[PDB]
From a paper:
The Agrobacterium tumefaciens genome contains two homologues of RNase D, Atu1151 (denoted At_RND, 30% similarity with full-length Ec_RND) and Atu4108 (denoted At_NrnC, 31% similarity with the N-terminal 184 residues of Ec_RND). At_RND contains an exonuclease domain and two HRDC domains, whereas At_NrnC contains a single DEDDy domain. This novel structural feature accounts for the high processivity of At_NrnC and its preference for longer dsDNA substrates despite the lack of HRDC domains.
The crystal structure of apo-At_NrnC was determined at 1.5 Å resolution and those of two forms of At_NrnC-Mn2+ were determined at 2.5 Å and 2.3 Å resolution. The apo and metal-bound structures were almost identical and only minor differences were observed. The final model of Atu4108 contained two protein molecules in the asymmetric unit. The At_NrnC protomer consisted of seven α helices and six β strands. The β-sheet region comprised all six β strands and extended from the surface to the central core. The remaining seven α helices and loops surrounded the above-mentioned strands and made contact with the other molecule of the asymmetric unit. The C-terminal loop extended into a pocket in the second molecule formed from the α3, α4, and α7 helices and the β6 strand. The α7 helix was slightly bent in the middle to better accommodate the C-terminal loop.
Numbering used by the authors:
A (entry chain A), C (entry chain A), E (entry chain A), F (entry chain A): 2 to 208
B (entry chain B), D (entry chain B), G (entry chain B), H (entry chain B): 3 to 208
Amino acid sequence: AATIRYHEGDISAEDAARYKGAIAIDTETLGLVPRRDRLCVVQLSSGDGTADVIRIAAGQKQAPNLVHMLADPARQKIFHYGRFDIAVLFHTFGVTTTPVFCTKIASRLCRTYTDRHGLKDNLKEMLEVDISKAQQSSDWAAETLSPAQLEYAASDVLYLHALRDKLTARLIRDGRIEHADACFAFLPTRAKLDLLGWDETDIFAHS
Amino acid sequence: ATIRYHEGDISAEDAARYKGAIAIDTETLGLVPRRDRLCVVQLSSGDGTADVIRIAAGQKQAPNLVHMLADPARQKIFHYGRFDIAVLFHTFGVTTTPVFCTKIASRLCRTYTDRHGLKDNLKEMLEVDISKAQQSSDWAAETLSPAQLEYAASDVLYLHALRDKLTARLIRDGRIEHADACFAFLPTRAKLDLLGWDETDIFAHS
Amino acid sequence: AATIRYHEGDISAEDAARYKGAIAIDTETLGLVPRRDRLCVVQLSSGDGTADVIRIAAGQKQAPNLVHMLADPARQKIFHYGRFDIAVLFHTFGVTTTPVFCTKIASRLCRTYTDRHGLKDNLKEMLEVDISKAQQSSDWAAETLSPAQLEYAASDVLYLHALRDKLTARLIRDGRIEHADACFAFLPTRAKLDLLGWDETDIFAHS
Amino acid sequence: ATIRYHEGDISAEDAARYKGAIAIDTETLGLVPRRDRLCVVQLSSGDGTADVIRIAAGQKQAPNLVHMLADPARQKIFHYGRFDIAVLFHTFGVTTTPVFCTKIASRLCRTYTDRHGLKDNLKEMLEVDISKAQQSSDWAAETLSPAQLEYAASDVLYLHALRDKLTARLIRDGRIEHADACFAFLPTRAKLDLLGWDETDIFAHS
Amino acid sequence: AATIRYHEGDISAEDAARYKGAIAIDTETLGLVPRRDRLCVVQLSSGDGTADVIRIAAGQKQAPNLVHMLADPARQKIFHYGRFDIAVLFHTFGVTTTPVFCTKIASRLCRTYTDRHGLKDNLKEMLEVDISKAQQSSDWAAETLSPAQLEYAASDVLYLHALRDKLTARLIRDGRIEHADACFAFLPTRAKLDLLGWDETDIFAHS
Amino acid sequence: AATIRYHEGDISAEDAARYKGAIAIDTETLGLVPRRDRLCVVQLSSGDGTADVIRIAAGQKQAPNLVHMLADPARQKIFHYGRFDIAVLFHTFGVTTTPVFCTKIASRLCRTYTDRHGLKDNLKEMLEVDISKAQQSSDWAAETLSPAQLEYAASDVLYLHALRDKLTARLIRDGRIEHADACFAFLPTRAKLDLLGWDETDIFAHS
Amino acid sequence: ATIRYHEGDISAEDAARYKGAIAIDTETLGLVPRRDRLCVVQLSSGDGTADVIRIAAGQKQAPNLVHMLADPARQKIFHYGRFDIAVLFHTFGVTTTPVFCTKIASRLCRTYTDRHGLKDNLKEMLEVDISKAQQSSDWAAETLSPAQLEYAASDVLYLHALRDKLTARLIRDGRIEHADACFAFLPTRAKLDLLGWDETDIFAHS
Amino acid sequence: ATIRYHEGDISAEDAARYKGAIAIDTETLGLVPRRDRLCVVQLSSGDGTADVIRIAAGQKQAPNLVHMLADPARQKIFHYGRFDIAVLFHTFGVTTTPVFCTKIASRLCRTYTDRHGLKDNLKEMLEVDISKAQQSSDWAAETLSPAQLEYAASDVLYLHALRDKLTARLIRDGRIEHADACFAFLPTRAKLDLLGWDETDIFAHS
């Protein structure tokens, strides 16, 4: 019945069964460099106002119930800036998350009247929802996640279905849903190119 | 006879020579598609001959060429297709598909150099020499010169061979799947450029 | 009698008849790239403390009463940074707005003691009028403009006659009215050069 | 006899040769008008001959030249008039009008190159070769050398022909009206430079 | 008896006679480019807590009582960033102000523990005096200077003797008084080089 | 019994005897350029909540009790950004401080989820301790240090043992203690290379 | 006979030639170790001969080479060891120690020049000429060419001599102790690069 | 006989040749005075001959040279004295005064060029050719080579003549008083550099 369902290592089968459709997802790590900074938390939400928070142990390389969800082509995974998380999940578990919807790419493609494409600003404008970023820069490898860390992790996925729905309607209205879908199809490759060593260059540029 | 010249569109007879992949480049009045009109489209089937099609100011149709560009059964090979795909969509409304880009391929496998232009690729990969002297000529000239026609043909005459060599390197070095995904995105990348995202990576934060 | 007169598609003939002289004008769009971001609103004021707000539909390419006002050489159009709006109006309707007075160019030419040439700062110093920029970055394509969007649109044109008058007096006092008038005569060409593809370069520079 | 040399001002007799447009350039002690004085003004009527006028330190009048510069009935042709118009206004108080600038014209039509200098324009458009060797000489020298006089004349001898070729390109490519509006603004752009706006586009936000 | 003695055109002989020693001085203009932006106000203080504020008219090229003070080698002129004001005064009146003490140069040479060398920060640290910069960016050519403009002009010179005295003691303590004096001797040339056309380059650099 | 024990010139033998293990240490100077800006204060703490504050006189080149502590290989010296202080101490006294632990290097090596590696931010996150930076940019050469300067100097060393202990545990947890120890072994050379003339280049780069 | 070629690992017999310091360089597919695989390791004992070891894709062991790299009794000499030490650790898991880097040495003593590459060092310090023509070749080629083998050997043949000359300069100019401390840190600097600190000095504020 | 070589200090006999202005330059181990020691001081009286003084590591005195440098009755001529004045103060504690700097003079009068180095000044102003080949040599060498001695002498042999030509231009173009004030500040500018203000103009806001 909990708003924040906590797991160690992997999601339970009962909680994975809550996800009959799209899966909202984010991760927390020790930093922005996957080969240096380990995966610490994976958080998920089915869009019903509750979330799963999964603590990932140091050195952990399998999470079979979660990994099946990530690879399942029948269920879309929704991220805000999936470029990073898709890379972290491939680096850690060897899974290519697919198919994906990225609300940051979607924001860039339809919220053409602003330069503010972060999650907090998207949720404020599109949903009139306030989230706090205070815990983004904390030690996510802690043995005991703090109440504030659990709040942040859950709130970071609780609103992604609703945000995707609003941005999808804007993309359809403004004629860019096809462009968005092509971006989402390339996103796992973009993440893998980062891991391989092209993380600071646009492969489509001249240089 | 190795450079077949056409006004406006390739003939149906010459289009029928293209039984497989189509090497393609364009020439324009500059690097800004909405400012700098398409002036030439050049094609080769990889048999050592080329078709050079001169495009008129204001021309909006080229039915035989457009059918080739849209034909999903025949790959189109470009060097830096990001630009030409945008120009072709801007001019004719056609989305060229499917594509292979030898510049993207070069960037993904020739990791030991920063020289990814066509001339350098042709020299290293094929020992073929081309001259870039006519690159900055007036492609809207009333009469294209013999030097211009030779330059335009040379930009397409070797793309099948270059594609094959770079594909072998992509296989050897493990990046053929990444290259194919880049090629699948390339028409969208070109369309995003036309809409004013030309100086930003849509996959970056900004 | 309304302070904010609302129109769909075009201004009414009765309201266009209010403009016996200069026309204060601005636009709202989906962003700063005319070939990508459609025109959404045109707002006008005759300088009497009231404004016309005209919602422009997606795909709309004619607005005959408005376009006649924009092209009428007998009535000056007053913009703050007309470089953008003149381009948007030419892109959308094919009209070359003329003649124009730009209060941003005027500010740059006479308010030589400051680097703050935006509308809010000009209105504060020159008129002791406060305006809020909160709604500048909103979805101007909304089917129902919000009360805050209507306030912003109206306030954005309500003070331009008064601002033009103050800046004109400063330009005369400080000896730069001729320079300003030459800038205003070039402004439609500058806007058209942006649309053609020179939007990021000064055509008068070496490169 | 093809380079007519004058001290201070052109003679009335030689000014009367100019029945139409006046090609014009200047030489100075550098690129900062309030620091670097005007040293030479060079003119050509487009007939293959030039007038070279040497300007003295502190000279504030040149009545025959100033009458030509202000005469609204005769166009003045410059390559990058933005600079010379400023120098002439700073020195003599004259606003040169009306003007044609071949550098603005080049930027508006030679969209396929970044080379908009005079030497490159003359080579592409006219197959005329000029040498820039004396560009960085001391133009305030007590005696101008034959090389300096040849350089100064060559900067004006071809501007009518270059104007005509670039005008044809502006017609072909649809930008003659934009060019004319730029020329109408150019004297104001030059005056804004003298006032300290030389490093900013007055039409930008900043 | 006034704290702020106002003058039009030139200081009176009676008020110039108050200055038996160093003269604290600043100017106000229409901006930072002397050939474009006219001199509007010259303000002076003898260090006794009162100031002279002299309005300079458009086109005015003489101010004989003031100019004698500026040129008088027997009385030091104290500026905060005299590089600018010395240039403006030479451009306007043809006078080379000498000798000078610049409290900004002095601050840079002895307040080596901070990057904040403006007047407000110097007065706060060295004298525990607060001044407001609100009126720095105002129209100084106004026919009627506002009460706030008069306050700003006076406060800008009221504390310069005291600031010079504190910074002089620091320069002596820390061994850099000779360097400071050499900088002050070069300052009029530095100002003149700005007017001539070297305003954006250090003449002592390679380029 | 004092929380802040004050010394002129050198620490007393009795107070040096308090340091049976690691020595927390910082300095204050007239600025960031050792050849220009003299050493003014050395502050130490044994980690018991009290500190020694030693005023260094102008021109002073010996401090034998302090220098013995700095050179003693049996006692670690703990700095936050020791690169600077190690250089200042070598420049002033000729002593090579060794061995060292730098909490800024340690922070950069383990607090990989943040870009905020200053002392104030480290103490806030790692210890929930607040310090004020108000007095960092003050005149540290004053004959009479102010109460606020004494507070700042003491608080700057009071928490370094505790910070070192927390960061050491993080470095061990995250696998980078060996990297940190190698950085600390190079740190005196890095400081000396700064003094010699390589202060603006990484000697390990290509250029 | 002066270039001994090996597949995969140096032979035990040839490793036994190395009684003292070991000059070493590598060749790769580019400058990003996790992207661009190790292709060649080249060694010299300083006797005018070299061992060139070609490394296979996916190769993770080279026992004789790794024993040399880890042997604390024999110094390894590199020019810009920061890169090669990282590549060797990434590929084989070995931490090369102890090391001398002639590029660090050059930066610490050749204070009158910005030219710290190997070719310039060899020319000034030894009057030895090497050519960099094969620097940007495909080092993963199925067969390394004679030019590639000569280039690879020349990169190690002179490092003992260069080390000796630069050591003399470090003694003369007072920086040998600083150099030795840099060499002691160099393996850590290389490991920090692999972890993503490659564009930051860990000793700076940021 | 035209290059008189000295160890440590000029002889009293050769110092007595200098009855007027003293042309002077130095050579060092690089551009950072506290890192890169003074190695050579070269002087000329303007008579076509030079004194070259080799400076030892750690040398802190040179009494005859220092007396010349401090002598207020004899001007010292440098090209970019900002550097050498700092090196001489750092090494010997002497404040060289009074000075003329031909690089400052060049910047104040050769307003039509960005080429203010010595070689370019000597070529334009005197038609004298010097070669910069030894600029980046090891000036702390145990034996200075004939090429080094020729380079060092050539840096001072023409400074009187260059000073005279640039002074004439400063007179012509109205900036001799500004130049003299710059020269009066130059020793302070050099001392501020040594104190860490070397990358900032003390007269700027920051």
